[PDB]
Design a protein around this ligand. Structure first.
Ligand SMILES: Nc1ncnc2c1ncn2[C@@H]1O[C@H](COP(=O)(O)OP(=O)(O)O)[C@@H](O)[C@H]1O
Lengths: 281, 411, 178, 314, 227, 123, 167, 227
């Protein structure tokens, strides 16, 4: 995997299995399972009230208050409709299927269920894209605490929608290596002329964001994407939203792998040194 | 809120993945990794050299077992990790693709085989603390988790905190005595037989007897007949005579599908129904240099334990791991043990003139439905507890002391 | 550990070299007396054979083990001939001619177990154990020939010929000197 | 260079039979092998294997035909050819650390063992016990004793040590031996008196030897230096420093010439003159011994080393 | 469409030009820029038949040999290709891996009147103009200055090659934005101090000291006192 | 806990010859005063600094004549000062001492270096 | 500053003098045989430490003894990225010390790698090829680190491309 | 000695032969191609003496490895070795005939018709071993009998799209002639049942007469004594 895929395998697996047994009709076996995702998301799949025939998925985004300010509610209703039951206790969204009425379009309902985290995030982008595609500019700026020390700023401008990922690097290795990757992001347009402009500010907030309490310190980085009309339009917005909200974990994922890749080469270079010393025997 | 810790059980046959607080693992996957083989055109002179992002072009688990253009590798051997380059990649896709847990905020419970060399604990902690960035790790002894899985699943009132646990994974078999929740580590014995040796012995025996199985599927069919047609026999020489005389009922046809031509093929399944798992009682078959039956080793383990605990142990022999699942396995192990212990007592009557008769010993061998994933379940219950976050090595400990914090073990 | 060992070491039964001249229930001519019990040392060997070849350590209890082991080594040799035989009639005729060949005796070179059998010193030892081992071979081959061929077609059966590769602790009565 | 590789591994000591027909060696283990010159080629004839740890010195008494061995097991044994097989005799050596060197006295009544215990054990036969018993030289030896050589009068013993200093000691055993004659080193010589001390202060002293008149000691040190103390100049000592690696062993070959060898793997001649009292590098591994002609007028000498094997020179 | 013939064709051209002699002007109708652009494409993304991934190495070797005989950077038919190629990511990288080791792939034979060191030559020809100096990504040129600032230090006096690295620093200083980023300037000055003071008297040592005098006279930041 | 118990235990002449330009003698002038016997530490650091001034201020092409003028004692002393200057690195100093090393080695051989290693009274 | 050829030659001639090892059973415990440079329990058997350096950052320390010599060497970490890559290279070489018979499992404090030669190694292995290995290491180490820096830069660029190209 | 030792030590590495981890194709290839040379460049009597060493253990281990190996590259070199060994001595041939090797070759050919190069060599080696007319285990006829004979007749009549040299027609004629050579009697003969059952054989018919016209015997490929 170079890119991080967007759909949660545990939902995608368990719902596909349960709906398969519903198509065979053989037995409504019980399910109860909880699992995390990235961003501190904490899903729960359960039978509601013990009804083995009903299956309920729940999301638990910690930042859903001050995300439903930017829609994140009408969108869920537009996409899930009849499946968007009332929230389970302690969770912000729930989504209830049953093995009695589920349609023959099994693959569609299971795939769209796996997207549940994406369909929560997507409303802030879809709103601000629609602002830019309609020329409003004076609107307020969306601040989303997708982690508790690490915040996304989505801002609309007549020419642009910009997505600033504040981020934090935990070990000095990750700072030094991360500073390399984003240098290659800075120049990355040279090999991909249409790609969005990526700016990296290191310790210091970027100068336009410098009107909020953005952090300062050696571990902090700000990455700014710039999305043009070739990205925010109605044909491209869905793919663009899929990419953007995964970027932060894409960056940290490849930092991990690049350290592993170094280790592979070091063992090789060691073996070719040992081959020399063996001639002293 | 508070996110559940991750539990990863790096088996020699099947790795088991999920989060704390679930009654089942979210994934059971074969512990293999498929890597792009085209480098073999250059790699004739030396091992494959990686560049670019080619080392991200790999698959693990069921995505990897039958791909047409990737060579499958099996990193784990006798429970030990033998090629850390491949295992380090295997961990990346386990964490990020399957679990999708960001390592930075999930504690990890990561299991260990009791034979694991200290050097291999240093490496495994170094990868988890420093290649990834786990906030805390706990290397947990597989046997104790298997016993606790039975303890927490079995009926109340019979939840004894003492037992002898026999764990036979795919790689090695371990016999672990536990008393009052303490592992008597001095008294551990290892039997160098497990599912792989049973599979390979069937695989050899088919290749002597039944040419026509295509070499690519030689391992597939040996595994399939083992899991579906094999059983522990009551008496070997008599079973051969039974098969020779009533072959019409004992010989079973197996029909397989060719991986390439998709023609069907079929075989007789015969002596390798009872041969195979017999190697637990006659290790000299599969292994040149080990000879004590499992029903011999188990008694030597117990009869080395402190005199007070010996009788409790015989009451609660726990079978664990998939290689113990053969039909009639526990029934024979009990019979062999019972014949060994009651004679040990009978001798001490004569050497005492019959002035006193000893109480019998109630050899009981117990089995439970978790056995395909019992170690994992026992981990997921441990990892739910608040004590787990007190027991783990915290990341700050690996900052004050190096990998050396993971030198130690139960022995 | 415990491979199968000979049951029938009666104290009345005489020894030559390090081998016990157990009675045989055979019509072939030879010096050992005629057995009348149902079980016989050649049938011990033939009954144990399938199990016995799998064990890889073998502890000699007595001279009868040095005798019964010799039969199994010879069975692991007769199976080589009769797997090639198209019919039971061919095998039976073949097997008679196999056993009369001059196999090595204890300590004569190429015999596989010179560490463990001592050579007979004298003619009345040597000639008699040749006359004994010959009739053991003659009977042993014929008793296989009755049961390895499946009666439906005289196919030398898969279940017996499977063992041809599995020499008894890697010892060949053919002898490694050839 | 006559040469023969007995072993690949370090020949840790050697000693020669009376007529040089046999050579005793350590094959870098706790056994002693004797080889006989079976024509052009050596054949092993005996294997003395009583020691419990690596033998570090061998010597062979030419008149009595007895082999003494010592080792890092803290044993010493005197081996006598009982008919055809060598049999050991106990030495009550009483040292708490490894032995390092052994030399028979020229009269073969006694021998000395140098050791890591910061002592020299002087051994002589105690026939009522049928074992060998020791007296210890001790007082000024501050570290281990590396090499020994006897004055031809069998009383004065010269010793090199890790505390950088060569010394001469009077090993007069009043129990076995008549009082010696006076010498230029001194008239006093009761047991353990200190006759001489080296001026040196830097390198360890690897090798020590007497001239055949006993009037001169020479030693070699880890400084890559040779020194020679002459008793007739009243113990004035010559010095020559050299450009090559250290020297490990040395022998006189005449009253006015030395041969030495060292980590350079080849033998080196140092001459001396009694007029100016200076050594001269006449030029050209683990120890050297004289085959024929002795220390007065050697005709052949031989060498063995860590690099393995035996070599004979003329 | 014949991977084997392509490999041998590239190898033979590298073998043939390996002695750096001038060619008939009629050759550049083909051996001119369109062929150079073809070779850059082969290195930048290769061919489906190249399952050995072997043409990129052969074509890197070939461009070094082709350039070996050209006299200057302005007219240079290869450098005009690099200027006009859309993006030279891979070739930039492979050229540094060769310079780092510092060997010359073009000297495949032992013939004695040897030409210049081909890779030092090729880089001096790259940097001779601002249009080709932009070939490098920023991180690549940082690693270039580091590699050459090392090689200039380690080479002993009187080596033919030390002049060439001195000349390549002179080229980099003179045509890149060097004095506005100054990546290794302290370490460079500390070496140029030593080189200029070097009391050895061979002709090549005199030439090394002269090119430092040229370099510091052009750019007074060089040779200034340490910070 | 039983197991853990610890138990059973010139400069006015040197700068004169330098300023006269008598550089070959200025090397000799430094080597007259080896502080080998001194218990004081600061005397050693002073003596090493004084000799380093001569080794640095020497012209590189003349080092051959300078070393060759010393006796074997001076050459062993020169080496003992050379290996000292390597423990006080400075931008120029290491470059010249590595040259003084090669010429002192050609005069004294590896044996001269061994007498640096074996020297029991550290200068 | 100083060129590489004099520095290596000075190291070689020094290290050539220090490998004059000998077998020597210890004085402090009954009959243990141990390298004096590591146990340091008696000090008349230790040689004077000597140091060779070509600038203020690259230095080779030689610590001799009657039966062993310890060689510990430091290499210039010129960049922030090189400190990480050098540490990993040394770690993975040091992780295999049973194969490099002359290598310590931990460095000497303030040095990047440190070799320990015993008398046994000079007796079993070719002594002169041990020197050549220390020198061959010391020649190649910074070329090897430079190669890693380039290879990491390349990976970062390809990974950046694989994200942006999808928009 | 070294090669047959190491090949055995790999054959029994029961972990690596089924759950691969190490890379081993290269070392095996080098050992096999070295073996193939020695069996043909060296004194035949030495080569005999090592094959027949301990009741043909060197041979039978290498045969058992071929059944177990499945890299097509390694299989192809093993066949070349078996041919050279088969040339040495009829005692080696009769061992190969009696071992498992013929059965795996016939199973391989019927299932993997795509590797034309292995398919040709397989038929060659299979005809070579049968060339002495030694009696086989009856268990062999299970694969070798009438199904396999029909498969060969189809190839010689119809060919395969991958054969551009037409070597398979000629080799399959020689292989049918080799297998028939040892069969007794007449009516039950497994090859004759195939000829009877096959749908209008005709190319085999006229190919067979062209052999009789010249009177040569393609199966007598070796000079071994009991013709
Ligand atoms: N029904 C069965 N009978 C016998 N063996 C089985 C059965 N099911 C699975 N196995 C075997 O269990 C073995 C070990 O599986 P597992 O216990 O997951 O090993 P580990 O946990 O050590 O990786 C495998 O070889 C598998 O073939």
């Amino acid at each position: 995997m170079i890119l991080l895929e967007v759909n949660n395998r545990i939902i995608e697996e368990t719902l596909a299995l349960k709906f398969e047994n519903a198509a065979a009709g053989n037995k409504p076996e019980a399910v109860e399972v909880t699992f995390a995702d990235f961003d501190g998301v904490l899903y729960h799949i359960s039978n509601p009230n013990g009804d083995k025939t009903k299956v309920m998925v729940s999301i638990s985004l910690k930042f859903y208050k001050e995300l439903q300010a930017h829609g994140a509610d009408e969108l869920l209703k537009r996409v899930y409709g009849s499946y968007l039951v009332n929230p389970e206790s302690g969770y912000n969204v729930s989504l209830l299927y049953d093995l009695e009425n589920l349609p023959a379009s099994k693959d569609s309902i299971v795939h769209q269920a796996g997207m549940l985290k994406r369909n929560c995030f997507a409303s802030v982008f879809e709103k601000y894209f629609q602002f830019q595609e309609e020329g409003k500019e004076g609107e307020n700026r969306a601040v989303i605490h997708y982690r508790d020390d690490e915040t996304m700023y989505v801002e609309s401008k007549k020419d642009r929608v910009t997505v600033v990922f504040s981020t934090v690097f935990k070990d000095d290795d990750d700072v030094v290596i991360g500073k390399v990757f984003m240098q290659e992001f800075k120049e990355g347009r040279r090999a991909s002329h249409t790609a969005p402009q990526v700016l990296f500010s290191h310790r210091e907030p970027p100068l336009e964001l410098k009107d909020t309490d953005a952090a300062v310190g050696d571990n902090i980085g700000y990455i700014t994407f710039v999305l043009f009309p070739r990205h925010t339009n109605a044909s491209a917005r869905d793919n663009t939203i899929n990419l953007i909200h995964t970027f932060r974990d894409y960056l940290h994922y490849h930092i991990k792998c690049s350290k592993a890749y170094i280790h592979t080469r070091m063992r090789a270079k060691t073996s070719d040194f040992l081959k020399v010393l063996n001639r002293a025997r | 809120g508070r996110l559940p810790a991750c539990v990863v059980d790096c088996g020699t046959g099947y790795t088991k993945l999920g989060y704390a607080g679930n009654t089942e693992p979210q994934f059971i996957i074969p512990s293999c990794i498929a890597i792009k083989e085209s480098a073999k055109v250059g790699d004739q002179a030396q091992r494959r050299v990686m560049k670019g992002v080619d080392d991200l072009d790999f698959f693990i688990g069921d995505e990897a077992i039958e791909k047409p253009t990737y060579a499958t590798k099996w990193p784990i051997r006798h429970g030990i990790v033998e090629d850390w380059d491949l295992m380090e990649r295997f961990m990346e896709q386990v964490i990020f693709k399957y679990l999708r847990a960001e390592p930075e905020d999930h504690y990890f419970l990561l299991t260990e085989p009791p034979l694991n060399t200290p050097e291999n604990r240093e490496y495994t902690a170094e990868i988890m603390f420093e290649s990834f960035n786990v906030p805390g790790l706990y290397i947990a002894v597989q046997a104790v988790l298997a016993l606790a899985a039975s303890w927490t699943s079995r009926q109340v009132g019979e939840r004894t905190l003492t037992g002898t646990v026999i764990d036979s994974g795919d790689g090695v078999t371990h016999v672990i005595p536990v008393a009052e929740g303490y592992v008597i580590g001095s008294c551990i014995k290892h039997i160098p037989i497990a599912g792989r040796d049973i599979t390979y012995f069937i695989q050899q025996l088919l290749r002597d007897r039944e040419v026509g199985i295509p070499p690519e599927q030689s391992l597939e069919t040996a595994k399939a007949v083992k899991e579906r047609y094999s059983y522990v026999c009551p008496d070997l020489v008599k079973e051969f005579n039974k098969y020779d005389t009533d072959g019409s009922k004992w010989i079973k046809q197996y029909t397989g599908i060719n991986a390439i031509s998709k023609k069907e093929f079929s075989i007789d399944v015969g002596y390798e129904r009872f041969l195979g798992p017999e190697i637990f009682f006659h290790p000299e078959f599969a292994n040149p240099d080990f000879t004590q039956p499992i029903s011999e080793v188990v008694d030597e383990v117990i009869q080395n334990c402190p005199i007070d605990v010996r009788r409790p142990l015989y009451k609660n022999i726990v079978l664990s791991g998939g290689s113990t699942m053969f039909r009639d396995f526990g029934r024979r192990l009990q019979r062999d043990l019972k014949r060994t212990v009651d004679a040990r007592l009978k001798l001490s009557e004569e050497l005492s003139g019959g002035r006193l008769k000893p109480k019998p010993i109630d050899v009981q061998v117990i089995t439970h439905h978790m056995q395909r994933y019992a170690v994992w379940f026992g981990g997921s219950m441990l990892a739910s507890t608040p004590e787990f976050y007190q027991v783990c090595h915290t990341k700050k400990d690996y900052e004050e002391i190096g990998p050396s914090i993971c030198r130690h073990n139960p022995v | 550990m415990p491979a199968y060992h000979s049951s029938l070491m009666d104290p009345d039964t005489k020894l030559i070299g390090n081998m016990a001249l157990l009675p045989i229930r055979s019509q072939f001519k030879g010096p050992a007396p005629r057995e009348t019990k149902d079980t016989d040392i050649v049938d011990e060997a033939i009954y144990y054979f399938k199990a016995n070849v799998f064990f890889k350590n073998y502890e000699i209890k007595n001279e009868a083990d040095r005798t019964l082991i010799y039969i199994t080594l010879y069975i692991s040799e007769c199976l080589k001939k009769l797997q090639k035989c198209n019919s039971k009639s061919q095998g039976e005729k073949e097997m008679y001619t196999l056993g009369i060949t001059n196999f090595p005796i204890p300590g004569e070179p190429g015999f596989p177990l010179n560490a463990i059998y001592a050579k007979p010193a004298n003619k009345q030892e040597d000639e008699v154990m040749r006359a004994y081992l010959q009739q053991l071979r003659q009977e042993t081959g014929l008793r296989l020939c009755e049961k390895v061929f499946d009666p439906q077609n005289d196919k030398p059966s898969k279940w017996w010929t499977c063992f041809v590769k599995r020499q008894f602790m890697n010892k060949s009565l053919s002898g490694p000197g050839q | 260079m006559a040469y023969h590789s007995f072993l690949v591994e370090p020949i840790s000591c050697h000693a020669w039979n009376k007529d040089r027909t046999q050579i005793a060696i350590c094959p870098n283990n706790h056994e002693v092998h004797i080889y006989e010159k079976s024509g052009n080629k050596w054949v092993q004839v005996h294997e003395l294997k009583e020691h419990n740890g690596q033998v570090t010195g061998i010597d062979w008494a030419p008149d009595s035909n007895r082999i003494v061995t010592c080792g890092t097991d803290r044993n010493a044994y005197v081996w006598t050819l009982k008919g055809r097989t060598w049999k050991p005799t106990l030495v009550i050596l009483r040292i708490n650390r490894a032995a390092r060197c052994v030399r028979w006295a020229p009269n073969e009544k006694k021998f000395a063992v140098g050791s890591g215990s910061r002592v020299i054990s002087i051994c002589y036969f105690e026939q009522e016990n049928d074992w060998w018993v020791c007296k210890h030289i001790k007082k000024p030896i501050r570290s281990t004793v590396l090499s020994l050589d006897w004055h031809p009068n069998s009383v004065l013993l010269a010793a090199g040590s890790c505390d950088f200093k060569c010394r001469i000691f009077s090993a007069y055993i009043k129990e076995v031996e008549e009082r010696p004659a006076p010498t230029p080193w001194g008239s006093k010589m009761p047991f353990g008196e200190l006759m001489f001390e080296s001026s040196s202060s830097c390198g360890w002293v690897h090798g020590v030897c007497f001239s055949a008149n006993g009037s001169r000691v020479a030693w070699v040190s880890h400084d890559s230096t040779v020194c020679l103390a002459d008793a007739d100049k009243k113990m004035a000592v010559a010095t020559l420093a050299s450009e090559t690696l250290p020297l490990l062993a040395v022998t006189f070959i005449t009253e006015s010439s030395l041969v030495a060898a060292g980590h350079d793997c080849f033998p080196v001649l140092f001459t001396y003159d009694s007029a100016a009292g200076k050594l001269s590098f006449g030029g050209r591994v683990s120890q050297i011994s004289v085959l024929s002609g002795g220390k007065a007028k050697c005709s052949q000498f031989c060498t063995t080393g860590m690099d393995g094997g035996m070599s004979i020179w003329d | 469409q014949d991977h084997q013939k392509l490999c041998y064709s590239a190898l033979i051209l590298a073998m043939v030009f390996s002695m750096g002699e001038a060619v008939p002007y009629a050759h550049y109708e083909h051996l001119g820029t369109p062929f150079a652009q073809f070779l850059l494409n082969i290195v930048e993304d290769g061919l489906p038949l190249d399952t050995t991934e072997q043409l990129p190495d052969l074509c890197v070797n070939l461009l070094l040999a082709l350039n070996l005989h050209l006299p200057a950077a302005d007219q240079n038919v290869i450098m005009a290709a690099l200027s006009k190629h859309a993006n030279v990511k891979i070739f930039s990288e492979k050229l540094l891996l060769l310079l780092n080791r510092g060997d010359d792939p073009v000297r495949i034979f032992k013939h004695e009147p040897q030409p210049p060191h081909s890779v030092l030559k090729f880089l001096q020809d790259v940097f001779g103009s601002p249009a080709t100096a932009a070939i490098f990504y920023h991180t690549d040129m940082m690693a270039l200055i580091d590699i050459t600032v090392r090689h200039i230090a380690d080479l002993s006096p009187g080596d033919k090659l030390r002049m060439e690295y001195l000349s390549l620093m002179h080229a980099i200083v003179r045509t890149t934005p060097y004095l506005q980023h100054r990546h290794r300037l302290p370490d460079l000055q500390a070496i140029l101090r030593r080189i200029l003071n070097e009391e050895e008297t061979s002709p090549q040592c005199q030439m090394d000291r002269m090119i430092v005098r040229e370099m510091c006279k052009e750019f007074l930041v060089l040779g200034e006192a340490p910070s | 806990r039983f197991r853990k118990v610890d138990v059973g235990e010139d400069e006015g002449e040197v700068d004169s010859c330098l300023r006269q330009g008598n550089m070959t003698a200025a090397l000799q002038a430094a080597l007259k005063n080896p502080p080998i016997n001194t218990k004081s530490q600061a005397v050693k650091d002073r003596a090493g600094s004084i000799v380093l001034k001569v080794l640095i201020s020497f012209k590189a092409n003349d080092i051959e004549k300078a070393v060759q003028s010393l006796d074997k004692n001076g050459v062993d002393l020169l080496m003992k000062y050379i290996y000292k200057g390597f423990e006080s690195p400075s931008d120029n100093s290491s470059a010249v001492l590595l040259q003084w090393h090669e010429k002192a080695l050609a005069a004294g051989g590896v044996g001269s270096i061994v007498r640096v290693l074996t020297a029991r009274k550290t200068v | 500053t100083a060129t590489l050829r004099p520095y290596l030659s000075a190291v070689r001639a020094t290290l050539q003098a220090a490998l004059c090892l000998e077998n020597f059973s210890s004085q402090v415990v009954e009959r243990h045989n141990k390298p004096e440079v590591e146990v340091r329990s008696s000090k008349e058997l230790l040689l004077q430490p000597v140091t060779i350096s070509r600038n203020e950052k690259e230095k080779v320390l030689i610590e001799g003894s009657i039966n062993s010599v310890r060689v510990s060497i430091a290499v210039k970490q010129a960049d922030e990225i090189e400190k990480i890559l050098c540490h990993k290279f040394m770690r993975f070489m040091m992780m295999r010390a049973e194969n490099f018979f002359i290598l310590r499992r931990k460095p000497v404090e303030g040095y990047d790698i440190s070799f320990l030669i015993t008398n046994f190694h000079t007796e079993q292995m070719y002594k002169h090829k041990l020197v050549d290995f220390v020198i061959h290491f010391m020649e190649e180490i910074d070329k090897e680190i430079s190669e890693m820096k380039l290879s990491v830069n390349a990976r970062a660029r390809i990974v950046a491309e694989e994200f942006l190209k999808n928009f | 000695e070294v090669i047959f030792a190491d090949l055995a030590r790999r054959k029994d590495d029961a972990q690596q032969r089924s759950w691969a981890l190490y890379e081993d194709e290269g070392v095996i290839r080098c050992y096999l191609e070295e073996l193939l040379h020695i069996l043909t460049d060296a004194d035949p009597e030495v080569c005999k003496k090592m094959c027949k060493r301990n009741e043909f253990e060197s041979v039978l281990a290498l045969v058992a490895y071929y059944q177990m190996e499945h890299r097509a590259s390694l299989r192809l070199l093993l066949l070349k070795c078996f041919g050279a060994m088969c040339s040495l001595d009829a005692a080696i041939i009769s061992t190969l005939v009696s071992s498992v090797l013929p059965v795996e070759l016939a199973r391989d050919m019927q299932t993997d018709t795509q590797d034309h190069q292995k398919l040709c060599y397989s038929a060659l080696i299979l005809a070579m071993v049968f060339s002495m007319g030694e009696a086989v285990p009856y268990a062999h006829y299970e694969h070798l009998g009438t199904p396999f004979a029909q498969f060969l007749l189809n190839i010689v009549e119809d060919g395969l799209p991958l054969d551009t040299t037409e070597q398979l027609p000629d080799l399959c004629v020689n292989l049918l002639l080799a297998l028939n050579l040892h069969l007794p009697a007449a009516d039950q003969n497994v090859i004759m049942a195939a000829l009877s059952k096959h749908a209008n054989v005709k190319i085999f018919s006229e190919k067979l007469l062209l052999l009789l016209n010249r009177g040569d015997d393609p199966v007598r490929i070796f000079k071994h004594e009991p013709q």
